[model samples]
Target chain A: ESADLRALAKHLYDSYIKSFPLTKAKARAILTGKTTDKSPFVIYDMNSLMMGEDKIKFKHITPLQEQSKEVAIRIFQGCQFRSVEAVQEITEYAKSIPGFVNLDLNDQVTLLKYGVHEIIYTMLASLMNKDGVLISEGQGFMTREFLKSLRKPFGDFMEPKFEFAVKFNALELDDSDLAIFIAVIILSGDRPGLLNVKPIEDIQDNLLQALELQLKLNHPESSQLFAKLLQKMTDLRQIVTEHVQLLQVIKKTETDMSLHPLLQEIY
Target chain B: ESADLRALAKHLYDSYIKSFPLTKAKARAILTGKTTDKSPFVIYDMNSLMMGEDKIKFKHITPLQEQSKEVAIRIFQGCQFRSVEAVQEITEYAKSIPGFVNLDLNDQVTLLKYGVHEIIYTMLASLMNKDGVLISEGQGFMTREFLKSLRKPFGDFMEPKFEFAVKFNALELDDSDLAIFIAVIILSGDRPGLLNVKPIEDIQDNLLQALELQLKLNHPESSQLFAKLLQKMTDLRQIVTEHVQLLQVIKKTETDMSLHPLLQEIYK
Candidate 1:
């Protein structure tokens, strides 16, 4: 890969943290294969969007997937509004974020969680590098490593928790040549956000909800790329959940409810 | 196509408009067929990009023939940053809404431009019918009659400038998906910014200078995809002044410093 590609991919790690704030140590664990399921994951948590699984609610800036199409777009609108905010509830202690969006006073403690950080990093590492692997200790490579030693203190508006660089080598951009990069943290990566959790059922639910949330957050339009895929392929659900964890790291929080038995099998 | 791809394309449109509004209408014209290149009309201008020609200053987002990867993702970011503040340069003149973003710059703009309005409408139109050339009014079967009635405008936040929606079907996008959407705009469309005037004797020098400027602003990263191709093509003079005007539009502008004229002659 060219230096630009490497730089961009590394920036993806940094950008994710800029948006959310996950520590380098945490990211290293995931990148180096120190941990399989990493930690601190999150997704769009809409207490107002609880409409059973049969009928899915679309969030603004949503991303959808048509497995038939092998195409995905991020969405931006159409969220369910609950009587109260869902974050407070997650902080109160919900075993896991719910899958379907709904509005019930009973479920006021719903924290919209999704998997972005861990899985996305895994996705990035898997897709970006040669053998689907990237090892990182105190640093990974190039500018990122040097910046830390210099104590550059994260250049303007990017200090809290940002790492990673997203590159598009095969997909060269148009005039600008800068690949489309959104390697930032989740919109709500602070406090009570989580992308990884145990209890296969709960993880599944959170992943679905996270996808919906990502649709609302990433793009201006409300869309989803993996909605149906998540529905069809059970593995996709966990993969998506992992993607959400990347966002959590961006938010600079180590929030996770990852205590599921199924994790060991996958890890 | 997945919903994400659809949204990303539209978002890139939003980003282009925000960056440079003259290119805004030009882009829309390209998509709508108001303008033309040897290629199919795109709502927003991107022929230069779709055909691998953008600013002499910026490195090409890779070249030709097909969509680069960033097409969807670039569009998505444009959609996300659909704010008076983000795209203020272009929207300041084109949108005619001085404070559109201030009205709610947060989640709302994201929803209107990229999230729901732009991508959803395009995707729905595609779903409604396929196998038709994308035009300004709309795409697919219902375009001719249904141009005025599309529901994308129902959301109060949008201020679509074109008579009909631009044709986006042809834009295949770069690898990044969303970024290419915008990058293509710079490459194609009636791009005005980079076509600064200069004599032919100075054009090559100007092109090189402009290339340097572009490198400073955006492609400082080096070894860009377009740069690699450009090294081989070596159209320094042809590239700098008239590349943006290369589209095959009916009436050419007076300044007429873009790429369409030369390109049309060569291709047609």
Candidate 2:
């Protein structure tokens, strides 16, 4: 069992090392993580954005409304639906982990509570193809220019995220790399109200140590890559913190109190 | 002893609430905390820029250098000195708490590692008078625009702190409010590798409950002030995360590695 765990960890690391610059090279780089090319090993296929594998549809160049409140809500709805889909995808990813389901049910919720957005943002990086994020899978791609024109307070709030997403895409982590990174975030030692910090910390250390060993084997010349990768967690922390503040703003502005209960649970 | 603690907390809160309208009324208004006032309650006064504290001076209009490496180093040094000074102030404040000095010294360092930037930014909010931060006990007021023009990377880095500080200053929390707020940050239950989460959590809850009771008693008309104050802590968390990232950038860019050893130790 111990050997199996080690082998699987090594395999996960190896698979990631193999995919890079080959598949990722094809992904036309943008300024943010928002436009990085989707990986082949992604749980959901970005190419088959919708199914029965049929393409989803939306206006390619939608007109920007003049500070339109209606336009704002649609943008909010777009973000909301995308956020919902992300949670769905992330939950499935969580279930596939080796010991994920064996933990206490509440602990699972705790992990998800702390980790869902981190994964969501991580996936957002995968979904970015260049200029903007693909909402509802490939159904809609909101461009950098269009997102900038979003009305008043929402525009000010949303622009920072797009800027961050652009830069995050630049890091160019492959899907395999993301798989291990997600595990690190889920098993993070820092989650509040955690019931088992030591065991969780042990698991996090195990994953990190394996990640370090793998990075060393795969990228022999790149000494700083592992530390740089860990640094993204800090970057992601900043982005998600802003997103939380954005949630607070959205809640403040919407008359119907429209944020989903699930989002309320996680953020 | 409990009564003494409550009285001191009340005294601290009162000092802050009273300072405002006198010192803070010049800052703009925001709905976040009902007033936008600069504060004297800060560790340093941003408005009165003075080098030695015995004497202060400023130019109403100072020209910015174009891509000045010297200016960047200067800004870095200013931030370094202020961050060090903040550690001194915060340590003194923490010791003032009844039980804080009794904790293990390693734990004391641990709390400061995670908590210092949060508290610094929180205190920075208090120091912000409209558009600038008072650095070096008011030897100079570093204007937001001036900070934005320092140099590449550093400029991009320092501007966010100003924007957040400007917005947070609008919250208009007085020194007494801050004394309690700072306590909550230091006593956080969630800092990684804490020796005793339960004891820390208890202290946090006690401070929060007292802050709550005091806010209700003091601001009889304001119902949501306490919740709003808690939200500011969340804002502080976000700001500090960015600051940590900026520190990373500074580490990569600077050839000299000029960050103070204490600053490096905390971030490391």
Candidate 3:
């Protein structure tokens, strides 16, 4: 039975590597500040212009105050579009997990609604390093200083994500590990409004078993890796909680901004 | 190696039952709304007097407005004293766990400081039923309705605890299960300001292995008991977070009231 579960886990990992929009190599390239395509390299840094560097042209340094709303809206829209795409991929991926479809349809939606943000944030680790995240499909790098410059309320959102991603990346999880991790998050029995908890929990337990086996094989030196990853799932809950609150602030303040209908449903 | 770990876990369980102020039998008696000793059974209900039952003597009935401050203060003080005792017992209990003493002395304190409340709340499950919690050494039963009547800020505190406990009791975990669960809570690596995390994680991982094995043996019918219990630990974190915020409110508004020095240090 344990061997069968491990085989199932391997199949899920293979599917995960193939299905996601961001490939491991592509994410690594982005993390190392390399462009995936032939687009010109552009770095945005708020401090560059002030440091009296001639190469720090206006195009390279946009002060936050002059571009706050525009950048915020762009980031917001980018997130919405990407989230919609991610949901599609995740929904398809979730369906492929053995027992996920057997759950009540509403429970499935409830699990996805709460778990998607965590999954998105988990995936974001690949495109992120300590300095900042890769934007515009690995073409443009936004410095942490520039993100901080976007000013209060709006600026506060990405800092936590960066903090989370930097530490998460340190784990060096491959797509296989993430596939099982994401399944565990979505199949979590703890999400509010879960009707059939036992079945969902059963599914999650099998995934956790598979995950533990995979982690032991993948990161043998780190005896505490599985425990650390579980702790990260708990941490992700807090991050998603704070993310919802900040989104509420944005909704109230950014009157002109609109969320996509699908985004509206999930949030 | 696994057998040795299991034996160590059993030893911890035996010690947990022997220590702690509330015994399993006493807690069970409290949950059934029975007096542990020869004390009179007193039930406090806000609605009893309103219903006009002559048997609802004055001592049996107390309105929130008339007794909120007094009851609130008493409960706070009671909690403080009990917590001080609990901390001492828990610190001792923690030391007996195999790797706990090996941790940094400061990390040990840090673990106890954050984890004590979770332990207390988990133990409270024994003294709680769906209707209310047993108070004042199982002599007094405070109804959920009366607690709700205590009104904003002050009254709000116990309801969440009751909610947690009632559900926790449904799990029907015994002293042995709780012994390892408490160890896991204290040894948790997620608490802030830990100087060393790897050792704590290692300890917790072993405790979790013990817990999973114990749960499988103890609750063969419920395949998900271990997972559910782990989820409860996460839930406990939110409960404690809210408890701290409520404590801050009580601190600011009740200026005349003071916390025990031990409580002050922990909350500070």
Candidate 4:
């Protein structure tokens, strides 16, 4: 039964990635101008859509009052815009999974709301090198020092996540491992207020079996990777917790920027 | 469906406590020499049981070489002994849940293995008051100063947990709330490698629903209490991660004090 579940999970994982129809090699080539896929379904190209790459603009935190309210707002807005884009990417990827779309709209909303950040960071971990993330499709990287130079809670928020992502990258899972792992996180049965938990659990159980098989096939000499990956889920839970705490504090202060309604609902 | 689930959770929570039948008040009385519960099931009076209540024995961290190997081991032994007893008390309480015992034995072992330390700290939070734990049943509260007085990895191991517990106690949850919340931790379906995921999740869903009802009925003025309790679960996850790191370091060092097989298996 477990073996059968593993096979189903593997098939499901393969088919889900198949929908993206973009391999890392192709993505690399496209980014480097060696190859180009013109289909607009690749749509936003979030990788290069960052606010500004100049280090001078984010050299250090200045008093919010020093900037015009409009300017202060703009600084925070970039963080929110990036968040929205990340979630949009994650939502589209989630739709590729086999029984996910069939979940009630509310269940779908609940799961994605709670889970989007976790999936986003898991994928982002692959782009992480030692000190920071590979942003701008490897054209530029965001250093932790620069991230910390951003204004108030925005820096606090990104700091813990970058800390976690750096350590996660140390685990060295490839693209296939991340695809199955992200699917497992999205289909997680433990999300609060899940209405159709049974089917969700069924999906997750299958994903786990598939993940186990992947771990075995990919790293036959290292038996510990599976357990370590599971431990990262616990780490992910902590990072999300800190992020939510920052959101709560910001909501109370009503300081500068309002959380987008979609984020408001998720928390 | 949610209301029905909450109702069942309340009933299960009530029955689970009835099995223990020992209130903290009476336990305190016995410890203070004011009263006693002679029943056999209070078989482990570990809260009051200690080698001796003499503070002089644990006053400072002696050089490892200054004491004989036997004496040095004895100092660390109490910490290990208490940990073992704490996990046992937690395991017995988990067994009282109606749906928990229905889990496959392997599933039960896997869940408990990962969850025991988390539950222990939640209860330990109650024993905390600002500065330290009310260990030895209030015979003497062990202060942070006292914990730091222990030898190297032992003191390092305890310091981070005490920091977490002091802040957690600030939430001011009563015993009833702790009862339901601790059950939620034990029944978590998210433990890695659970065989019967569905049943474990069913149990957790009820526990959450019941915990919500408990928080609302008990602290109606603070509707946020339910969310705060769940937030503490995340905090518990973070602290346990730190503790496991310390354990890994200790294991690597082959620290003189051996971890029990139960702990070794859980980490593996």
Candidate 5:
């Protein structure tokens, strides 16, 4: 009986691995401390890189200086546009989970609305190392120091994400484990305005059981991994809530910056 | 062997019941929806009460106007003083628990520092009803609406608390259950900086098991009560984090308002 459930869990895991943008091989390579052989693409040092080589040119604008409100706005807009793109991948992955499609349409929307930021942050581990995250599809690296130098509220937002990603990346989870973990996040029963909680909870419980089994099989010696992962889920809630607060400050102060309409709805 | 654990849990529960300020009888009375016979002490309508009787006067000040930042500062100051007092009770209660005294002193302080706000909010249920909380230790009832009317950052601090309290009060947990529940909060393994996490986690696991058994024995019909209580603990984390954020705003804006030294330490 349990074997059949494990099979279902594997199916869901595979669905996530398939739908996600980054390949498992690339995710693994990044996690194992691999970096691009190409020259470094640092945000603050971009002007020097551009002076050195014409090949370094990319469509995305890098800040000329590290410490201005204008530079912060540009970085935030770039992050927001990337976040909006990630939302589509997450939505597609949520639809592929076995029980998610059966949910009421509004509940589906609500879960994605609240859950996407957490999922995005969780998936962020793949694009991150101890120092910083890979941006623009691994062509550029935004060092944590550069992010921290941005002015108030903007600087505040990225630091927590980096802190979370640093620890989360330490777990060394493969795409299969991340897929199930993220499915657990999306199908959480605690999301606000969830009209059909029991079914959502039921789906989540099954995923959690699957996750626990998968973790034991994958990292048998790491006795507290499952508990630590759940704690990360709790930590993500606080981080995302703080992120939204800073976003509100940004919205008011930086009126010239335009938020993508989809990002606006999700926020 | 399990009987010994149950006995330990009972002792811890009794310790909390002894240390907490509210009597189990009064806590029960509040939960059962009993109102005072001494007439209403609504903050917004205090002018009429003042006119009706001289006996209604207490040393505490009530705001003449409800919507000002000055009034908000007064209310916040009162709440902060009350919170500082509650901290001693929580600290004593933490010491009373069996395994807490064995940890590193800094870890104990760290746990108390982060855990106290959540514990205070949990205890807030005893002082609350669906509409508002008892202020001045039941001498006055400050309506939730009155608290909401206070200007930004001040009003924002309280509304989440009322929302949590309303749902928590619905759990109908008596003092005994809350004792172990709060013990669970204090002994949490994940309070930022604990040098000895394994011991804390082991202690918390024991308390959680005891809590589950107690809830099962007490409220057999409420199948989801235990899970809901755990969720409330998570909710408190967010609420307290938001509370701290608003406190920073208040600290910057309301320079004239003084925070108790104890609170300043906790926030620091």
Candidate 6:
């Protein structure tokens, strides 16, 4: 689906260019060209149209390359969870989604595996609500079936571990949805921007405990973020769970067999 | 999956209440002979506590009820490359989701379908930039999957769809990640909170052209969204193309041994 949109958008743009060849000079002006290369075909004012969306205008998260390990670390440090395990799982989810795995094996091991624990600790700090259970799993999945069919240039694996947690209201989701929500939780749930310091482990520990203290005091919106996080967590999980399950199965079988061959077709 | 979540959330709740009687005030209050009509121990913030991992909030899109015929109207009104054909396709998607088809039929006909077009239209409100294409057939698979598992009884779907777009830089993702992103587009995106009084038809027409204007105006962040939408659309079309080709083969085989072992056993 993403590919289709890319192709169509490109096709459409090519067509647009074909139609307005004279305006092409002004079209390529943004970023590098907007100054000397003055063109009438200014890019659309995308900001105003961004209504009610979660448009967090942080400078760091703007580009894929710019969103570095530090950003990932900040995301892990910032979240609050009911359980350390939950926080850990979400950290893994966030890291897995972005092209984080592309880094060295040591970094991947540190970021993919151990880094999650500290982040979950940080998340749990804010949450520590009353002992009531809030069991969300942070499982990530690849949705593109075609992509799922062939492995990535390096490697890919979907960790569907049932690592459950008892998070605070801040954690907000349950079952598979909460699991998926954890990806976004680490991705962007904590604050509008990335974390600011070194001694990253210390910061994670302090932040985790700090959020817990705040939750204990009932600081109004602590739980609100928790709930919102859960909502996002669960919402994304729904998209991947069976979707990935189906993809995995689809990959194993003949490509010729479409997943959509409904049960009725057998009859 | 929707059914599974509903069942699990409720079951977990029941178990929680059983283990911690204090949480289930209804049972205790009745035994205690309280005069109040409602249970005393009910969760103060039901939405939060009830949806906790302990409560185990289920993963899903808009609660089935939140999806409306109006969503279709909102989208179709402003879409380009649309007509009655798009509307029919939308209707089928809504139907696949079950509750969508159950909407008051009075407005269901075109409006239900309109909801789908609206999703696509608004999704790509800005002119197609990095946004991908969406194939109709993939829409069918996606529609089938989305409808079967819904969070309609609770959270709103539109919110998350926007959340996916709002939070993630949709354009930067690779084809695989982008496809997952589009799934979020369907599973989570929310509608505008404000209500529009204008009739549905008028809205659809307005979006068709108005969307382009917004894109041209580079409606705040539109370039990003249109680009993202284009990516998703393209991804969807790719999936559809592949799936359709696969479907054709499956259709031709007419008899595949793997589909059902019981049939194979009987045949033997």
Q: List per-candidate RMSD values in Å.
A: 24.2, 19.8, 5.3, 16.4, 5.5, 26.1
Q: Per model, how much of the real contact set is kept?
A: 0.00, 0.00, 0.13, 0.04, 0.04, 0.00
| Candidate topping DockQ | 3
Instruction: Write one digit per residue (lDDT tens) for candidate 4, span B46-79.
Output: 2322323333244423334345443324545656
lDDT for each residue of candidate 6 in B181-205, tens digit (9 for 90 to 100): 2222332222222133234323322
Model 2 Cα lDDT, one tens digit per residue, B132-181: 66654433345666667656767776666776776666555665667787
- In model 6, which runs have C-alpha deviations exceeding 4 angstroms? A1-267, B1-84, B96-99, B105-114, B118-268
Error of 4 at A267 (Å): 28
Pairs with steric clashes in candidate 3: none
lDDT of 5 by residue, B144-206 (tens): 777787777777877898888887877888777888889888988667877888898888777
- The candidate maximizing TM-score is 3
In DockQ, how does model 3 score against the reference complex?
Answer: 0.33
**Displacement of the residue A103 alpha carbon in candidate 6, Å:** 5.8
Each candidate: what lDDT? 0.28, 0.59, 0.74, 0.63, 0.74, 0.30
Tens digit of lDDT per residue, candidate 3, span A148-169?
Answer: 7774776887899998888788
**Candidate 3 chain A weakest ten by summed lDDT:** A51-60
Candidate 5 local lDDT, residue A90:
89
Query: Taking the candidates in order, what DockQ does each have?
Result: 0.01, 0.02, 0.33, 0.05, 0.15, 0.02
Off by over 4 Å in 4: A1-267, B1-65, B69-75, B252-255
What local lDDT does model 2 show for residue A43? 13
How accurately is candidate 1 docked according to DockQ? Answer: 0.01
What is candidate 4's local distance difference test score? 0.63
TM-scores for chain A, candidates in order? 0.22, 0.71, 0.82, 0.72, 0.85, 0.21
Candidate 6 lDDT over A1-267, as tens digits, reads: 344433333333343333322221232222223354422221122222122122323222232224343322222222222233344334444444433344444444444343343334323322222221111221111122222232341112211211122222324422222222223233321222223212232333232222323333343443323223323233233333434554465345433445646621521
In candidate 6 chain B, what residue range of length 10 has the lowest lDDT sum?
B133-142
Query: Each model's number of backbone clashes?
Result: 171, 22, 0, 0, 0, 106
TM-score for candidate 2, please give it. 0.45
What residue runs in model 2 are displaced by over 4 Å at the alpha carbon?
A1-267, B1-5, B11-69
Q: Model 6, A84: alpha-carbon shift in Å?
A: 23
